[PDB]
Design a binder for this molecule. Structure first.
Ligand code: HEM
Ligand code: HEM
Ligand code: HEM
Ligand code: HEM
Lengths: 142, 141, 141, 142
């Protein structure tokens, strides 16, 4: 439920996001901050330390595919459920990811954006991204 | 339960907050009211407009309480008993709301102290704020 | 944080469990596997059929751990450190699952010890199991 | 998603539930076990002790209207969202009840049923009521 001004705020800032590094950082921080999420990535190698996770090449590669999907939901912000119907199915029937973890990843992404943008990540900018990440968390919950 | 490294991390990070701590409390309160408007129902008689002086004052008190909890991180239930009396017994604040203010504080620190907000400190700070929240929502008096 | 009355309540209630404790552990494990089938993914090499002897054995060990946590309710992080090593570091059990086994234990006690399962004991037992769950999912070593 | 045998199990047991006492007990126990839920019932008088809550006449009366609604969802188990559309609106726009509290009340009801039925509340009976209470919690979340 974004206003036309919230849609514009969110788009202006996504323009300036490094799409090679932010997804990895977000996924990296999820594995370090909520350590049980690593059980879902046992095929990714060494996740034993924060620096092992943050330098892991498979975490960075996978984080790019996650941020691709957030980018895709920002383009189809009025029809999120559909956009994420195929993906809601992988997380549930094939992977069983409890839906509270989807909200945890959205909140880690909002903090990574705050970390990169500083003063630009104003309270009005954050309030609009909170709407976007809640939308995506709700469309992935099957 | 905080590890010994989690305790070192929290002390060092919050120590870098310093005299900006009330300023960061007020920003976190402003981010929580804008991002999650249902939290305004706990402050019915407050001016909650931008730059409000009652939010600046309340931000300073919340920061001071967190400094005290950092100083007494090994014995937080004793250090925070009056605040647990207010939040859990008098106000009956729902615990969902403590997750929302903790997020807004983490966002405030990430935006102002990036070089300190590493993945390990983020993890330690998230554990510390969850531990403070558990005391404030418990009735153990 | 458990109150002093919460601690009296837990000791008295669990003391009434007595020698039925392994039997109640196994029922709680059986209720959790049937009601919430996703929990079976943590036990891939277990026979999880009704009356299975591996579930009876595991039910007895979970009950024994809870008796030990009741005896050391004031110092649970020290008492439960080996089990926190297994659940949080080795198994990486998601915390949502600790809410599901706590519910199945409460249902097991309500069904077998009704006269003890008063509203005050229910409240104290719910607080104790949430506190045990927090230690088991924390890495504080 | 109840099997024909789960539908029958659940109906057999609801038949034998006291509809004057179980709702009150469930609502009573919610206010005692999750003490912040009392902020929503400040107009109900004395809630200061467990026994004050459990004897409060307004808690018992209100608990009857809650159990009425569970009874109504058991009759329309295939169309829960609709059954609870008007009620999802009171809890959200007029009352703002965070949806985690809906799941907490369903789990307290399952424990009150266990307390009254003992051995009859078998693991197969509980597994079917867990489905029913999850359904009702999901149709009240707006
Ligand atoms: C909340 C937003 C999230 C989005 C947008 C997202 C998106 C994606 C995408 C695009 C893929 C790849 C799908 C494919 O390759 O076909 C994927 C796979 C996966 N996701 Fe997520 N995801 C999210 C949250 C989570 C969470 C919370 C977990 C676990 C805690 C998780 C665990 C996985 C796993 C295990 C895979 C399979 C990856 C592999 O096989 O290597 N995801 N997700
Ligand atoms: C990190 C967590 C929190 C800390 C450390 C904290 C700290 C404080 C402190 C220090 C006070 C004032 C004490 C006094 O003047 O006597 C206070 C009051 C208050 N807090 Fe919190 N708080 C936290 C979370 C919350 C949350 C989540 C809410 C609700 C959404 C909330 C609502 C209130 C209210 C309504 C008051 C009373 C305000 C008044 O009328 O003066 N607090 N808190
Ligand atoms: C009240 C909470 C819990 C207690 C007290 C508890 C206690 C125990 C104990 C005593 C053991 C065995 C220790 C040993 O033999 O060395 C154990 C092992 C285990 N627990 Fe838990 N547990 C709890 C919750 C859970 C939950 C929620 C899950 C997952 C859904 C789980 C999964 C396991 C698994 C997979 C093992 C290892 C089994 C094996 O392969 O032998 N536990 N737990
Ligand atoms: C989960 C299942 C629940 C059901 C089926 C349920 C059902 C109902 C019903 C039938 C009413 C009366 C509506 C009317 O009178 O027109 C009602 C009112 C209400 N419910 Fe619930 N409810 C549930 C959960 C909750 C929860 C979790 C809370 C708060 C923690 C809550 C707080 C209220 C309040 C405040 C009212 C207004 C009562 C009054 O004004 O005195 N309910 N609910």
């Amino acid at each position: 439920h974004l206003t036309p001004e919230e849609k514009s705020a969110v788009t202006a800032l996504w323009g300036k996001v490094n799409v090679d590094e932010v997804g990895g950082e977000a996924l990296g921080r999820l594995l370090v901050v909520y350590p049980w999420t690593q059980r879902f990535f046992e095929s990714f190698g060494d996740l034993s330390t924060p620096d092992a996770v943050m330098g892991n090449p498979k975490v960075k590669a996978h984080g790019k595919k996650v941020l691709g999907a957030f980018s895709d939901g920002l383009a189809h912000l009025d029809n999120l459920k559909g956009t994420f119907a195929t993906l809601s199915e992988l997380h549930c029937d094939k992977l069983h990811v409890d839906p509270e973890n989807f909200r945890l990843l959205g909140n880690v992404l909002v903090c990574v954006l705050a970390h990169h943008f500083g003063k630009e990540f104003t309270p009005p900018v954050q309030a609009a991204y909170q709407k976007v990440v809640a939308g995506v968390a709700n469309a992935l919950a099957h | 339960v905080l590890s010994p490294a989690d305790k070192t991390n929290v002390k060092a990070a919050w120590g870098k907050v310093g005299a900006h701590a009330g300023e960061y409390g007020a920003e976190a309160l402003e981010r929580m009211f804008l991002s999650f408007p249902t939290t305004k129902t706990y402050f019915p008689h407050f001016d909650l407009s931008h730059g409000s002086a009652q939010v600046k004052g309340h931000g300073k008190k919340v920061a001071d309480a967190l400094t005290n909890a950092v100083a007494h991180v090994d014995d937080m239930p004793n250090a925070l008993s009056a605040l647990s009396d207010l939040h859990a017994h008098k106000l009956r604040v729902d615990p969902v709301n403590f997750k929302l203010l903790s997020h807004c504080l983490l966002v405030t620190l990430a935006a102002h102290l990036p070089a300190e907000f590493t993945p390990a400190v983020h993890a330690s700070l998230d554990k510390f704020l969850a531990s403070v929240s558990t005391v404030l929502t418990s009735k153990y008096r």
